[PDB]
Scaffold this active site. Structure first.
Site, PDB file in Angstrom:
ATOM      1  N   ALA A   1      30.454  79.094  -5.041  1.00  0.00           N
ATOM      2  CA  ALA A   1      30.838  80.090  -6.068  1.00  0.00           C
ATOM      3  C   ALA A   1      29.710  81.105  -6.289  1.00  0.00           C
ATOM      4  O   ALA A   1      30.022  82.295  -6.502  1.00  0.00           O
ATOM      5  CB  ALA A   1      31.230  79.402  -7.336  1.00  0.00           C
TER       6      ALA A   1
ATOM      7  N   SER B   1      28.628  74.832 -10.824  1.00  0.00           N
ATOM      8  CA  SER B   1      29.376  75.852 -10.043  1.00  0.00           C
ATOM      9  C   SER B   1      30.453  75.144  -9.215  1.00  0.00           C
ATOM     10  O   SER B   1      30.321  73.921  -8.936  1.00  0.00           O
ATOM     11  CB  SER B   1      28.468  76.676  -9.187  1.00  0.00           C
ATOM     12  N   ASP B   2      31.499  75.879  -8.840  1.00  0.00           N
ATOM     13  CA  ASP B   2      32.430  75.441  -7.781  1.00  0.00           C
ATOM     14  C   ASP B   2      31.793  75.728  -6.409  1.00  0.00           C
ATOM     15  O   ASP B   2      30.648  76.271  -6.330  1.00  0.00           O
ATOM     16  CB  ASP B   2      33.802  76.083  -8.010  1.00  0.00           C
ATOM     17  N   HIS B   3      32.463  75.303  -5.347  1.00  0.00           N
ATOM     18  CA  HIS B   3      31.942  75.196  -3.967  1.00  0.00           C
ATOM     19  C   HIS B   3      31.675  76.601  -3.415  1.00  0.00           C
ATOM     20  O   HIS B   3      32.614  77.357  -3.244  1.00  0.00           O
ATOM     21  CB  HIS B   3      32.938  74.386  -3.125  1.00  0.00           C
TER      22      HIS B   3
END
Ligand SMILES: [Mg+2]
Ligand SMILES: [Mg+2]
Lengths: 727, 733
Positions: A258, A254-256
């Site tokens: 997300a 995942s992104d930060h």
């Protein structure tokens, strides 16, 4: 099958708590203080770390793992986008080299420096297609072309990972941002992406598939909706497509925040439901928000997720650590139990950064051979980017140290030595808008604000230009203007610097523009008024030396644009591989604007040289091509001028009658060729059925019999064409 | 089945040549000289005519039919978009009325005047959703909102066609442009449209379906690709969707040369293949390029098409003529041979009362500092700007049979209002553009823009002299109608630079500055919002525009218009629209960080939001109250609010109801319009508004295109614009 047996036997021994711990990806910060994080690693509650980038710090975290029951090693990741400590040009400038060997060299050195500091993985390459110049993150990609971006996607992944992911100088590539992130509506970062399946499959998805096919170990999932569904909750994208259609066997990250952001997207009402959607969609590793560690046990006990959801995610994490060699030796990138200076000059790669940075510089204008300059006379060096170390290394500059970077001014000073006289004036601040300066300086001091009035700086610059033989104006964007969340409504050079340029033009002195920027700019006034224009993007740690090499003719500019430069923001999007429409512009009742000239100011593949090149007539090996046969397109390139230099011969294809309206042309090959004066090379392009296939309305991926038009030229706008018929 | 028996019996008599003749739609022009066309009608080779618009001319063409074997009557079509001879405001201005009865009146009068001239059909309403202000054809639609555009689509069709398509005061509606034409990439006319199926079905297709459901007799097919397939060759769009799913039983019509344009699109290598694609996709009638007449016989003989392809197209044409009453009396809209000649353009044949009343309703008050408006009719008023005395611009683009000389300019409307009581001073101040290449474009084909030959400086000095001799300045500025027309896409949304230089010079006089804006698209008005004392958006307000504008400026009418399209701060923000998705990192008042979905070099959000418009009075809403916290499937709930006029002048405003579905299987818009009530209130008067909401209001198309309402929370917002709301929630069971 050693890997499958090892992971099956380990996972057979793990509690669900231990399996869930493997999914947790965190950084030392406000939300995870260092000593609390150390305690969590000792307890087996942490799978991986990002943003810890020195050997002693990484070694200290790996040391904590010996306290957990299974001693499962961490991996350590960073955003090594275009260099780690030695900063190469931004990706959009690397793409302008049109040279996969140059791009591979930047990636290999990045992985060498990152791994030497103990890192195992980079959140790179960024391979999103960009047709909207407003988006701040266009600096991070390879431009607008599916063919070139897909080629460089695979080149970057192979260069990072090498022949063996367990090699101590290899890092795992986490290709990003899966998917379609650069199609943000309005060019606003993180915004809605909405597109047809044929456009998605034909134009936007292939660079991610190229990364998967080159063996990328990891995929970083994007922050945007795709046709209403956030990527982080998109089971079609992450399971059906990535795993079941493409056969990806690696790790999704995942992104930060997300997963938590699914609540803001309006897919989830609470963190428990956001967690369920992300794990069941196919997100393996949870960055920073800790929702997986908080919610997965309760979700499993309530029967809201299956054991197989946890087991899939955990298997993917362990498989990445296995491929990285970390079960064979968790210290393989961290040396043995002598301290050193991480930022020692001796650990940089200046030769490589200077040679790479030369290749991406694009000559956009050169009236009456003003360039190259002789190292003589009085040269005024004016503008806010002339002495900027912070801007030359660009956005996403990793562990790059601005004080180690060569400015344009210092590059010119190094080049001339005692010859010529350089006259410096700052001339203007990067922006006249205090709210913009306050945005750029909001977290860190990024932009030096000269306390002098604009008028005082202008009077000083005019006095300097008057005392000189010619003016080198170093102008454009600060690196914070072309970054994550830095979307622009205006593609021009900032107003403060355009006022400076108009004042310098009025002196009558020859005017050379050195542009720094992380996106296509609107350059109508400059194309009309400047005597020469050199596009330098952000050229990195050796940028100033590479730029001086071109300005004084040590390197004959060979860079060519990989993204169309719009005449104004009101024309967005402009890209070379557009559809014809039923009323193409060549006259009022056509697809055009009435209040500005039409088409790009500078087209895809454009870039000038200090020499002249000639192409012989294009020759095809046949007028008819049988199924499963190869066609050859031949041209001879000659250096018909007075200086050695390289150019890029480009091959485009059109399918002029099809089941879908197909682009007016599509890049299908290129050859970068360095020639001495009077040298020739016979260029042979190979075309196969794979070059002729496209996705139709039903996503049938085939080549239809009929005419194909082959174009060869030194840019997308200046080609010669011949047709053949596929049987 | 008496209709289908009549048509079956006629088609049993027709040769393929006669059947193919019915599909031919032509205009008198270079490609079809009048005498060649007359001969083709006598031969049964013409199905219909467009752009012939007077009784004697239409009678003369119908007279040729007597000479053919089967004597099948022509229908006659025109582009009656916002008026025939009496020109109403452009559609974007009609939409700003937020009043279905105002829009119905404009359509009814248009059909009355068109049919009185012998026309049977209009190529209208235009019901394309527009989220891109650069597109020239934004003027022709109803703005950015699916609910409002769909409602007005059905209203226009019912008002045109009446209770009976054979009535001599009715015309057939050919709804356009099917489909998605306003989503053109880059806002470049005719350009590529590419969008997801859920967006297509939720947001863009409903206005066409609303027209079909209201009983529209015809559909005009669009010029654009839809996800790679030109509409004109799109069997999915024209057969699977329009006929099989929506049940449309009427006539499909190509746009001008659209069949031949399949070659330029790269779907066909030749006219024979283009013809096959269009007729098999479901295009019935072929406009102007004559490909159907040229190629259908060869295609049929080669077995490349089926007899059923010709039969379906011909049946659709004959059924339209049948519904229009043309088989019962081909002269039903053309009076009697005994009727004496008359002046087509006689004052007695206009509807000026309706144009003036309708134009009043669409005017939008955007700014009014310290109650400068309404003006008193006294003193010295400078009327300055290139649109002040423009008859050609006030009637807008697609002005049909509108006569500029019959139109009331802003200057003339002010003169009519003030009589002897005040002194008007006029100065042109600037040309509509300072860019010669733009003036060259606007005077291409037809000289439509008067160019003052003086320097910009001389015109500015004259305007400054005029302003100095006045008590206040009425600046009449914006776009010429040619700037917001077919193929007139803009890269700049500002008032033209020549007129902005004029406004900055006028501001510097210190005289109160009232902006009267003419334009066919949203404009970027940052400088004007900061510096003008008042701003009145007038769109192009038509034949009575200048009188309606003076009615508002002097306070005979309290402005009640509200925007139906978001006004971006700059072209660099396109697209901006109210019913956007939240993203994972929203930028709004409650989320103002650096790492959000925003621009850094300009203020964010629209300058004027959807639903925005001021009044000369003030309004208050009571607290929003819902009839229940829970809604059972099969049930309705009521959202209730009381509107009060808390000021000193009578006036109308528009109460707007929005819905949010905050948790869904796809990301749903932050707000979606689901109701509205325009209310006229005396000072101190109150009205209890009751909105009805059911499951139908709550549905959306998911990723699989299931049209479903999911159980959970719904938020109900009420306010007087999309940005000034409060919310209450209920739960759908
Ligand atoms: Mg083909
Ligand atoms: Mg819901």
């Amino acid at each position: 099958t050693d890997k499958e047996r090892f992971i099956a036997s380990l996972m057979a021994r793990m509690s669900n708590a231990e399996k869930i711990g493997q999914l947790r990806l965190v950084s030392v910060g406000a939300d995870h203080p260092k000593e609390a994080l150390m305690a969590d690693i000792r307890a087996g509650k942490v799978g991986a770390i990002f943003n810890t980038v020195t050997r002693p710090d990484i070694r200290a975290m790996q040391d904590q793992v010996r306290h957990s029951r299974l001693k499962i090693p961490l991996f350590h990741a960073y955003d090594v986008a275009h260099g780690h400590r030695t900063i190469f040009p931004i990706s959009l400038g690397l793409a302008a080299s049109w040279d996969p060997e140059v791009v591979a060299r930047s990636a290999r050195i990045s992985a060498l420096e990152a791994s030497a500091d103990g890192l195992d993985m980079s959140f790179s390459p960024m391979v999103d297609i960009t047709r909207d110049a407003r988006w701040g993150r266009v600096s991070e990609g390879f431009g607008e072309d599916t063919y070139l971006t897909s080629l460089l996607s695979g080149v970057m992944v192979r260069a990072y990972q090498g022949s063996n992911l367990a090699a101590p100088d290899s890092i795992m590539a986490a290709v990003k941002h899966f998917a379609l992130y650069g199609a943000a509506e309005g060019g606003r970062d993180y915004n809605t992406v909405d597109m047809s399946l044929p456009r998605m499959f034909q134009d936007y998805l292939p660079p991610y598939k190229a990364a998967v096919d080159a063996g990328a170990g990891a995929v970083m999932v994007s922050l945007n909706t795709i046709n209403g569904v956030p990527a982080t909750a998109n089971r079609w994208l992450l399971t059906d497509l990535l795993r079941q259609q493409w056969g990806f066997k690696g790790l999704t990250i995942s992104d930060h925040g997300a997963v938590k952001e699914l609540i803001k997207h309006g897919l989830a009402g609470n963190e428990r439901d956001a967690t369920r959607l992300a794990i069941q969609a196919g997100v393996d590793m949870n960055m920073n928000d800790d929702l997986y560690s908080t919610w997965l046990p309760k979700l499993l006990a309530a029967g809201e997720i299956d054991q197989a959801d946890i087991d899939r995610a955990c298997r993917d994490v362990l498989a990445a650590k296995y491929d990285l060699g970390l079960f064979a030796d968790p210290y393989r990138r961290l040396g043995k139990p002598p301290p050193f200076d991480t930022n020692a000059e001796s650990r940089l790669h200046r030769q490589a950064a200077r040679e790479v940075a030369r290749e991406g510089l694009v000559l956009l204008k050169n009236r009456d051979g003003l360039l190259p300059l002789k190292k003589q006379g009085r040269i005024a060096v004016i503008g806010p980017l002339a002495k900027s170390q912070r801007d030359v290394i660009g956005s996403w500059s990793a562990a790059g140290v601005p004080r180690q970077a060569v400015t344009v001014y210092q590059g010119l000073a190094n080049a001339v030595g005692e010859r010529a006289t350089l006259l410096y004036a700052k001339g203007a601040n990067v922006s006249g808008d205090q709210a913009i300066l306050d945005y750029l300086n909001s977290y860190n001091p990024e932009v030096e604000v000269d306390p002098r009035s604009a008028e005082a700086m202008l009077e000083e610059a005019l006095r300097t230009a008057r005392d000189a033989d010619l003016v080198v104006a170093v102008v454009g964007e600060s690196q914070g203007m072309a970054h994550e969340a830095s979307s622009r409504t205006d593609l021009r050079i900032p107003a403060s610097q355009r006022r400076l340029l108009k004042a310098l033009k009025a002196t009558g002195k020859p005017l050379v523009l050195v542009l720094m920027n992380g996106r296509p700019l609107s350059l109508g006034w400059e194309q009309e008024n400047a005597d020469a224009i050199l596009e330098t993007w952000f050229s990195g740690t050796e940028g100033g030396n590479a730029i001086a090499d071109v300005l004084f003719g040590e390197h004959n500019p060979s860079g060519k644009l990989t993204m169309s430069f719009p005449r104004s923001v009101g024309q967005v999007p402009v890209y070379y591989n557009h559809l014809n429409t039923g009323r193409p512009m060549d006259g009022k009742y056509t697809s055009r604007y009435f209040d500005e000239a039409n088409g790009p100011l500078y087209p895809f593949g454009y870039g000038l040289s200090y020499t002249e090149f000639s192409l012989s007539p294009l020759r095809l090996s046949s007028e008819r091509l049988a199924r499963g046969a190869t066609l050859e397109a031949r041209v001879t390139l000659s250096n018909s001028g007075k200086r050695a230099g390289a150019t890029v011969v480009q091959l485009y294809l059109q399918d002029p009658v099809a089941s879908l309206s197909r682009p007016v042309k599509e890049l299908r090959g290129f050859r970068k060729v360095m020639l001495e004066p009077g040298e020739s090379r016979e260029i042979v392009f190979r075309l196969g059925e794979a070059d002729l296939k496209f996705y139709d309305s039903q996503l049938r991926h085939t080549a239809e019999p009929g005419e194909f038009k082959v174009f060869v030229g030194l840019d997308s706008a200046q080609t010669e064409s011949r047709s053949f018929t596929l049987l």
